[PDB]
């Protein structure tokens, strides 16, 4: 309800920290788990059933039987938003997200060239849907 | 911000260690089949890390390395001795950029690495004519 509980799953420690730091600044979301791989994500998720939203790297290899994504989709009611390393427009990522059963996709934020404005907007849209 | 700069330096050193290990293994006569994946992942990680912090000059050097390695992985270009050589030079150049930027908490001046960029662009053009 409020705040919404977020799990961040990305093999890049820098991206996990960057996204976590950003979520600290949103009053409506907090981070409750972070994971670098599918099994760790399963371990943290299965133990933390209050997760409302999972942010998942679309570049992270799926487990061989897709146990993490399957568990998230079929054994929880968490929303799943894929994170893409490139612009979503012109990529196959929006279609790949739907295929995997994800509820949305958004580009990973960066300190490059505001900062997480699009990310925050997407997270909020997903939870209000 | 102390924590993210510490992580940039630590994660960056691990990625460059992996980049150098794969290249030195290739130079010693090990097969590309075992090393092109690890090499790509190391460079890709280093690139993404620099992007998180908005270090566009650092990012651009890693990006061109990734393009060259991608030609081997995807476009059937052999991992020849020249590629290995240029990427070893790149790894040393990236290591110096990492040590400097981590300490300045800012992007590098591109001047020192313009030669590397020319070499990468030349090899990319020649082996993908
Ligand atoms: Na081979």
Residue numbers in the entry:
A (entry chain B): 0 to 112, 119 to 134
B (entry chain A): 8 to 136
Copied sentences from the primary study:
In order to elucidate the molecular details of the interaction between CheA3 and CheY6, the complex structure of CheY6 and the unphosphorylated Hpt domain of CheA3 (residues 1–135) has been solved to 1.40 Å using Seleno single-wavelength anomalous dispersion (SAD) for phasing. CheY6 has the typical (α/β)5 topology seen for E. coli CheY and other structurally characterized RRs. Although crystallized in the presence of Mn2+, there was no additional density in the CheY6 divalent cation binding site. CheA3P1 forms a four-helix bundle (αA–αD) with an additional C-terminal helix (αE). The site of phosphorylation, His51 in CheA3P1, is located on αB, in close proximity to the active site of the RR with the phosphoacceptor Asp56 on CheY6 being 7.5Å from His51 on CheA3P1. The interface between CheA3P1 and CheY6 is dominated by hydrophobic interactions with only one hydrogen bond and no salt bridges formed between the two proteins. The buried surface area of the interface is small (530 Å2), indicative of a weak interaction, consistent with the transient nature of the complexes. In this region, helices αA and αB of CheA3P1 form a hydrophobic pocket comprising Ile11, Leu14, and Tyr15 on αA, and Asn56, Val59, and Leu60 on αB. This pocket is situated adjacent to α1 on CheY6 and in ideal position to accommodate Met13 on the N-terminal region of this helix.
Two-component pathways comprise sensor histidine kinases (HPK) and response regulators (RRs). Once phosphorylated, the HPK transfers the phosphoryl group to an aspartate residue within the receiver domain of the cognate RR. Neither CheA3 nor CheA4 is capable of autophosphorylation; instead, CheA4 phosphorylates CheA3 on H51 of the P1 (Hpt) domain. Once phosphorylated, CheA3-P serves as a specific phosphodonor for the chemotaxis RRs, CheY1, CheY6, and CheB2.
